[model samples]
Target: MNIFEMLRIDEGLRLKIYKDTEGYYTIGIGHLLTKSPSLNAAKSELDKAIGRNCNGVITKDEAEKLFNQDVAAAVRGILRNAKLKPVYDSLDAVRECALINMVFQMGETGVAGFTNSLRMLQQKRWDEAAVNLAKSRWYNQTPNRAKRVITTFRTGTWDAYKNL
Candidate 1:
């Protein structure tokens, strides 16, 4: 199952897709936690967030203008957890999708919150995996949206919603 295809964008959000000045296509997921003229541009701004710890690279001052401790901690957690087995086996597409989603919701640091679930994934432990997925602070903030994508990963089915 291609992770990218699994987390399909809802038609409503899909309608918001557009290319930024840099020509990178994106979808508008709503408000930016920080500050940006465009959501698409904001995402491109956070691309450095994927596959590595932003540390101080994408500072809140640079984009959001306010440092979010919760978001930062979550991302650091994700980086540590991604190194484990189940997550390591999940493929880059899934990792990238997850990272991007989390960044959209929380910020780069928020990605860190998945440590336990990632560890489970790294070990190929599926049932316990959702424990980590659900524990995220994002779970309650965007319940419906988060559930949809989490369903994609758990079921291993492509939802046919790619692009931005």
Candidate 2:
């Protein structure tokens, strides 16, 4: 699967104001509305996006547009990081997609904390990178999704999700 498709599966595109796994008030393809993750921010952004309150359903078109914009935001977040930009540039397309997938879930600061793993990745040491990632709290929190992303890093392919 491509990056967005993988993210779609990961996030599941909720329209209603629901609490995410971490209890952030979220909606519209994993958009966090509260400052705790901001009712004020959510209200402001939701108002901008849908011209309505957070309690309502957004159209499928709105969801799609929001998701696309979110993916763009995720991508933009990585390139602007001085440390991550080179790490991102050194990777192949599939590995780049995998990296961006992680950044999509966690902000650049969150993903950049994987210092040893990022070092291993920059060295193109795929197995070592995967091993480092497997030892992380992220792997513990979302083992299945973490495994899928790590497998792509390890194999430099999407055999975890797509059939060979």
Candidate 3:
């Protein structure tokens, strides 16, 4: 998916700043309030990462950059996992992107536990794959996201839904 679409899917688009689940200051599509220095560090890592006196606030462009970086890393992880098997490589874009989104949230190993869904996907049974995905604990935790991904897999189309 394109970066704009990904931002909408992964992190709702926001013009102003807010806090994430951990209470870190965030802005522009889930960009954590990350400074130059690393948190819990002895040295001034923040000074090295961002210039001294850099504020946490960011513009839309900056947010897009951060989004690109985050998505790139997630894609890398997804691609690395794909190298392990033919099934991963053979998936259509929608299915592949669905897997990438899941891995982005839960990591490769974490997503591996969805054995039934993965099996259905391997068999190219879209309906059964959606059903298996709905039955998963991940779906229980985030029903809306699960619905979107499942629908994308079932329809082979990415439908942008508001609120993720």
Candidate 4:
């Protein structure tokens, strides 16, 4: 599957910006609002990002477009980061999207810490890569989601998550 499809299944589509479970303002498929100097600053940034006046809501179409931008930025970061790009490029779409999903859940630097996983990916050891992905704190935090990503990464096929 492509990045967009994978991401939609992984991060549920949400049009309205609201305080997430952790209380951070979020919208558009889990786009957490960046920290700002002030509440106004945060609102302004959110407004610019979604191309609106920061009224605390966004349309599904706008969310989709913003998600596309978010994906692009994440991919660019993956490309620039030493730990992910090579392996990402080496794998097929499904496997490559696993890296993107990981990067989305964990930041670029966070995924960089998956040294053994990246190594396994680079060596094209699919089983080891999946194992490495599973044997992580991320897996513990979100088993089903991680499982879907790991399965797809290993088999290079779609592992549906129902919501993405």
Candidate 5:
């Protein structure tokens, strides 16, 4: 089953897969992470920050405010062409999904900035790929997140980054 399917996330809670300064790519159900959590909070907090919502949704204006030129383009590009059909039928669902989530969080340009690193992963050089994954902008943005995503790649599973 698809990861989302497995998680039973079809439509119960508001899940935010991506968020900027203003809003999130997915809607949220639990309390916003940025706010102080009460003692009885049901779920753990995600890494993203929360702020005022100028609009009902995270519109283009908010997106533009959060990201620069290159980052936005990279995200749009990846989303436009990321598919598992027509060519690589047996593609790694976990890897591809993880890459998409990673790119959404940190633009494709930033995630794929290291050509050598990507090449190594493409070549199935796990050691080199791990090394390369460690030395990128994603390293400092969210240490816990990077660790979790890396664990997914290491274990050959997509076991990270779903916030609701």
Candidate 6:
């Protein structure tokens, strides 16, 4: 039920820099390095953060540290999103985690792009909210995760993620 564990399972682990499905320079459990403006800049920052030369390789401990910081950033980004904050505050733990998962994977701006879905979710229109989530490139690109999140949106439960 921990957010870290949930995302860790989804993002997988890689100590070396690699291109994500979206082609971003990613590492350390979906921690996006391209956001640092360039690969060298990102690597330099990571090198300093891990106190090593790094050169595109990282350790599990280093990865975990970056994960922690990224999670905090994602969470804070969600909170700061004016439109999402109210609905976010109203969520139960499971749904809250689900929302965080969306932002963690997609970034806050990406999640915020789901205007219809967020509206329905805020109105407590569970069914349509779930339906709206499926009506996106996100759904087309990552159907399994999309379905899992949609079901959670509809039911406000963790059942979809349990593999039960």
Measured over all alpha carbons after superposition, the RMSD of each candidate to the real structure, in angstroms, is 11.1, 2.3, 4.6, 2.6, 10.8, 2.2
Predicted structure 3, TM vs. truth: 0.70
Weakest 10 consecutive residues, lDDT, candidate 3? 40-49
- The Cα local distance difference test for each model comes to 0.45, 0.81, 0.63, 0.78, 0.45, 0.82
TM value for model 4? 0.85
What ordering of candidates by lDDT runs from best to worst?
Answer: 6, 2, 4, 3, 1, 5
Per-residue error for 122 in candidate 5, Å, reads 0.4
In model 1, where do residues sit more than 4 Å from their true spots? 1-96, 159-164
Model 1 quality (TM-score): 0.46
**In candidate 3, which residue pairs get closer than 3 Å at backbone N, Cα or C atoms, i.e. clash?**
36-45, 36-46, 37-45, 37-46
> lDDT by residue for model 1 over 1-164, one digit each (tens)?
33222322421222233443224443332223224555545555445433333322343233322223333444455456544323534544554455445554554445445667656655656557655687665677566666766654554444524443
Error in Å for residue 15 of model 5: 9.8
Residue 88 of model 4, lDDT score: 78
- TM-score, one value per model: 0.46, 0.88, 0.70, 0.85, 0.48, 0.88
Whole-model alpha-carbon lDDT for candidate 3: 0.63
Clashing pairs in 2: 33-38, 34-38, 34-39, 35-38
Give the per-residue lDDT digits (tens) of candidate 2, residues 1-164: 78877777777877777777677777777766664645565556676777666444677778888788878887788899887888999999889988988887777899989889989999999998999999988899889989999998998887887842
Cα lDDT tens digits, model 5, 1-164, are 34333222322233433333334333342123333233122122232222453222344443333333323443356655433121112326665544544554555556656567566656667666667787865666556656655655555564544452
lDDT of candidate model 4 versus the reference: 0.78
Candidate 6 lDDT over 90-119, as tens digits, reads 887777777888998888888988898888
Worst 10 residues of 4 by lDDT: 34-43
Worst 10 residues of 2 by lDDT: 35-44
